[PDB]
Amino acid sequence: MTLAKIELLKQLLRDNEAKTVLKQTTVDQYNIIRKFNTSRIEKNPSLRMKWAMCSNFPLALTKGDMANRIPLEYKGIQLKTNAEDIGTKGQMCSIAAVTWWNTYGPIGDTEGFERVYESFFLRKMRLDNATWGRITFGPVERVRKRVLLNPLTKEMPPDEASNVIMEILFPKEAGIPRESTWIHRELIKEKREKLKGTMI
Amino acid sequence: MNINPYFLFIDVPIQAAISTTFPYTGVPPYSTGTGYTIDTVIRTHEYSNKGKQYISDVTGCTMVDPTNGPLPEDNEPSAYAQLDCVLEALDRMDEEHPGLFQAASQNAMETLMVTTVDKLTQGRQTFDWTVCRNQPAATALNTTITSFRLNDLNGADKGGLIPFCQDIIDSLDRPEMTFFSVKNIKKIKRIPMKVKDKITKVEYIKRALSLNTMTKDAERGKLKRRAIATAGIQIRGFVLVVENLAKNICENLEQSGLPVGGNEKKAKLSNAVAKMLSNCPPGGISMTVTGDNTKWNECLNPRIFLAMTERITRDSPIWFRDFCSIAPVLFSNKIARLGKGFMITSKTKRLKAQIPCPDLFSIPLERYNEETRAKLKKLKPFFNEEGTASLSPGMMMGMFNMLSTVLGVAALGIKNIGNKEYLWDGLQSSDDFALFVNAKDEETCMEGINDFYRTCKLLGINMSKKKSYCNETGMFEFTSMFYRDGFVSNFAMELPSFGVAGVNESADMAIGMTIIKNNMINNGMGPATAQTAIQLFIADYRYTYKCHRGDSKVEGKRMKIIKELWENTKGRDGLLVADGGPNIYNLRNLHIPEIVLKYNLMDPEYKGRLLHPQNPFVGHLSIEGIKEADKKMDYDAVSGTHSWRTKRNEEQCYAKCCNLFEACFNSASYRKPVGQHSMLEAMAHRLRMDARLDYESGRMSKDDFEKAMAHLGEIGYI
Amino acid sequence: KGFMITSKTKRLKAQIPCPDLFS
Amino acid sequence: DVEKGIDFKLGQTISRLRDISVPAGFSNFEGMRSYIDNIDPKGAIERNLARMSPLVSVTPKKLTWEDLRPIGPHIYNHELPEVPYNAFLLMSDELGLANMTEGKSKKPKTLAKECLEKYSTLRDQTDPILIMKSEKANENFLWKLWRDCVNTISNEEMSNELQKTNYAKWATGDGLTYQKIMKEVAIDDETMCQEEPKIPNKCRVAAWVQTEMNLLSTLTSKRALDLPEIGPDVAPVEHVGSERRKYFVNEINYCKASTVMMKYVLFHTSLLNESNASMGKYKVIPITNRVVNEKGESFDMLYGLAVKGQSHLRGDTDVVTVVTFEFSSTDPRVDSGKWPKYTVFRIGSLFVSGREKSVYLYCRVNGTNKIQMKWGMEARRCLLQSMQQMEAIVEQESSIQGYDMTKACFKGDRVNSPKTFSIGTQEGKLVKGSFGKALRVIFTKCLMHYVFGNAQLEGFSAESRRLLLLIQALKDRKGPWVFDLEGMYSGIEECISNNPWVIQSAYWFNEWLGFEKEGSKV
Amino acid sequence: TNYAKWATGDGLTYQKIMKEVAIDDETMC
């Protein structure tokens, strides 16, 4: 893929616009470059989704070797097509293939969900073991308060949160650790160990 | 017996059953907008026709100046705002608050020096002058950046918004203006190409000052249609800065309903009414005026906003004072585009033709309908030859919401006129104000109300005497929220939100359930109502994605596969509602994603298949929306086969450059990268390191390494 | 060939063939 | 460089624009800046007010009951025409061709085929008896189009597209459209004028609206509204919610308004599906519904057919034409004022239990768009609007006495009488109504707010809410004052033009205001 | 060419339709 990366880079540079923009915009400016998208946002998502679900192949599949696991038509039902794509450069597919994959196909690893989605399973644990009581139908006095919607493992400001996330799951690009990793070293090591062994 | 639904109000208060009055279940009204735009221009100039009429020598378009104009002698709307009175109100606000103006201006300047140009990509559709149309903000900004490169204009590459605004202001002086225009060349096929076009200085000034128009069709509770205006990218930076400053000022003001939204606004409303009830003298009356302002933007002169900006920044750097005063100047000399023009038809020949606006007066007026005849006979004085209307006075809806709110709060905060035995205070938010007047009797209450009305008329504000009423404190309405005897019914208007979110199965489901739970928390939706909402939403969700219960005899393409899966897997309580599984969601667990909810009940094969580490239905580039659902609403979902994306409905340059950079540095997609070097060299170094590591690990062959190296060699960073 | 009938308001014409001269 | 500071200086054109964009009395922006920075107002507001004319004021007038008068008196006037039936589909006149089915869900085309197969007399009827051709539609066009519809539905092939494709083009009037030319010729030609705006007619109070309001709000042995299951309820709160939900659905499900709502939703869903799937070909669409009786028999009901025109539209506001043929048991001659837009036949008769009753076909051309087309499938929210308020009602009761009353309000208990609202009237005597009947009335009100919804309805409701809140304030003796009452009244009454629901809402508002006026004596 | 079409009156020509519709239309004489 790194060879594919270099070949794609060379092909992109062959055009002069890519050469001039790449050599002009610094790394910091990249953000601006990314935000120059079409912004042709769908005006009504409900109608779009309704129409798409009735189309032959609305699903936009990423090009890869997964498709070979499933025929282009199974049990006389069309699943995927080999026609090229312009929006995503991949293939097209239908929810039929998705349902078949949920039915048959490769079997993945169940370990990752034990720890990766720890917050959700903790929510479920707090719900299941909760004890209910009576209901008081009388009027309730309520005050408007600034409340934390969800429990947090270790509340930190957004910048420290981003730095910790990068230090956890992005081993590269970790120049000069600030005065925040030492404070959260235990969290760093715990999350690092827990998330190791995954493929998400 | 003849039924009568209104009789429900005999046994119930109106506020309690207020939700049923609103027809927020039928088809909202929907639509040429040229007639409405011309009517709006006509009304805007009519209200200020007595001002000073002159001719701009920078653009040649007629201008009407109502500020410091004759004081109105009638109840009709008046834009004749006296500058001294505005400054008096601002001074009273400044005295009533400790250096609020200075703090707000300084904070606005600081956040401005940190703002980037790309912030202008947010918002809604914007007027693009290179094509003279309405285009997405991102595309319009990109096109203007590209055009500026040709005329020796730069600063977008320099980053911050200061250089972009500086070279935007510079562009107004260039003797020419070159750009790329779309040319639909005939070849029969119509192929679009880029043509290097040029326009003069006056044409460019007119294009920059022009305000595009559209019909406000989405409105729900108004019979007559209003026109919404979209401005160009050359005003977005200044309007944004002034709006941020006004937001900073108004946030502290306890009289301002904005920008706080939700239960905060209810808290403010109840707190204000309680405060006024507490402050009443003994045996006196505190009357509440339920007000609904009209012509709230056809009477506000941008010159008053220029004066307000200058007074607000009394003590600030000269450069910032000049910068933040550009938006009122651009708005005070704005021009309005005019829809797509009227349509004339002959029925004796079954012929019809739409007449473009520039040709409005190329036809004898005796052929338009009498109403449009009068409209054009009145619009002729301000009609530009190009097909635009010179609209100096007044404002279009939606531009200075915060600044207009600040002016309204300034009017509210005077609190007295002539030391008369009364006081007043209230809530104001963007064309909706509720006032409270405390006195020793009703007569003095209305003396105060009349004084406040007169004072408002001295600033261009004209409260609607037809859409407003007055009563005793403890019962009123503010921005469609009703208060009565301490009971604030959140008027149930979030009903049109239970449809599928149309992003994907799991995400749509999570969004719907979170919407249900939020409505339960906020609007007082009862448990039975929430259960029925869950039922209806699940019905619609199953229908829209053609996935009903596997047992049910319904026929469909995916339904056959769902039926197969129903018996091919033993554990039948773990399937998802997208896989014909049984619904499990209830009130107690609307806050838990179902995938984790049914994780125990699934089967090992089923969970392995659905929660595969790699899914051809899941892509990295599809993750953009995993955080916020377009208002940006946070939803919690789970990675899986049902996390797919729908098909799509210097562009490629930027797009593929960014895509490749993300694919190289996978960390870029999450957090802003940092570096003072060209992107090319960063990518080259990273790719060289990656190639060496891949080879040393045996993942790449030797011939592969040589090839890669050569390429990276050519590039010039090896 | 028959006859020709026409509506001026709709600006439409049609040919009635000889076999259909009484329909 | 930290000794310099930011540099941002205004050019020449922008500086000139600033110079000329100064309020009156100034000649340069430096002058305005100095004036604002230096001059101090110390009572300028009072100085301006001390001279402003005394002819400007809010005109504060106290509001009493007598000032409030009936809204839209022109509906009473008999010189105006009776309001017509402009709703998309028949509501209280639908005739359900009902076939018992094991429960299998089948394509609408096959369902309609079978339903007609059961009734051979109506399927094979080919000699119509014109009861009335309304004003413009052609009897030959409509009858031939309906015959093609029946033939296509009953054809062996699964295809549900019209086999003619050319007769329908003129039956639906697609070809009766103007041809667009370029602007130059229009400028040169003198006869190419501008069409005068077509204002809605000013009509009077009809009678069919009241009868439909009554009939759609009554229990029927047939139930169609079904809802998906939810997870087991383990908390007490969700147990109470389940009890309330059951008590509500046991009431709403059997009202005819629920069946009409489901028919509308299903028809619009099928219309959207056909439009998306088929773009430029005429299609046949049965108006299908599914109805379960108390015994659990899942009848499939065919209510008519509809030809869909060419829906090849890029935009949403673009209109697509559809012609509806509807089975009914009502002879329009009984009240011809209700059906001035409909061309009808008399395609036979049927026996429900031994009592023979005629069977007519109401044919009408109409047009919709993707917006209303979607809202058709979002019309189910009426149900929610029906429950929320009642929920609140019940909750209020629960606030009074501690226990839960949902059984008490609905049916009553040994300690509390059943809750009764005021629902109707007769001979000037208002009548009470059970909790379930009030819930039905609210649900039907919401359904009508949808079906008869347009700009007029919004302008009427959002502006008569002012008077509603003023009356509410008056009933609490808040002594509300008003500034311009006639302005509000004119605003409200400039919306009662031709919408049947708007006219009936005005009529009921006037009657209820009279009732409140007569009851205010205490 | 486009302008001459309407200037010369050639574009003001009645449209031919199938005999079925014409017989079924009572306004055609």
Residue numbers in the entry:
A (entry chain C): 1 to 200
B (entry chain B): 1 to 31, 34 to 189, 201 to 643, 652 to 670, 684 to 752
C (entry chain D): 353 to 375
D (entry chain A): 195 to 716
E (entry chain E): 359 to 387
From the paper:
In the nucleus of the infected cell, influenza polymerase (FluPol) uses the viral genomic RNA (vRNA) as template to perform synthesis of either capped and polyadenylated viral mRNA (transcription), or unmodified anti-genomic copies (complementary or cRNA), which then serve as the template for vRNA synthesis (replication). ANP32 is required for both vRNA to cRNA and cRNA to vRNA replication. ANP32 comprises a folded, N-terminal leucine-rich repeat (LRR) domain followed by a Glu-, Asp-rich intrinsically disordered region known as the low complexity acidic region (LCAR). First, it stabilises the formation of the replication complex, an asymmetric FluPol dimer comprising a replicase, which is part of a parental RNP and synthesises the genome copy and an encapsidase, a newly synthesised apo-FluPol, which binds the 5’ end of the nascent RNA replicate to nucleate formation of a progeny RNP.
A minority of particles are apo-FluPolB trimers, whose overall structure was determined at 3.57 Å resolution. These particles comprise the FluB replication complex, which is similar to that of FluA, with an additional third polymerase forming a FluPolB symmetrical dimer interface with the replicase. Further refinement focussed on the replicase or hANP32A-encapsidase moieties improved the map quality and estimated resolution to 3.3 Å, enabling relatively complete models to be built. In the FluPolB replicase there is a rotation of ~15° of the PA-ENDO(R) towards the PB2-627(R) domain when compared to the FluA replication complex, allowing the FluPolB PA-ENDO(R) 63–73 insertion to contact the PB2-627(R) domain in the region of W575, a contact not observed in FluPolA replicase. Conversely, in the replicase, the PA-C(R) 609-loop interacts with the PA-C(E) arch domain, reinforcing the replicase-encapsidase interface. The FluB replication complex is only seen as part of a trimer (determined at 3.57 Å resolution overall), with an additional monomer, FluPolB(S), making a symmetrical FluB-type dimer interface with the replicase. FluPolB(S) is less well ordered with only the core visible and not the peripheral domains, likely due to flexibility. For FluPolB, based on the observed trimer structure, where the third FluPolB forms a different symmetrical interface with the replicase, we speculate that it could have a distinct role. It might assist in replication termination by binding the replicase and releasing the 5’ hook of the template so it can be copied.
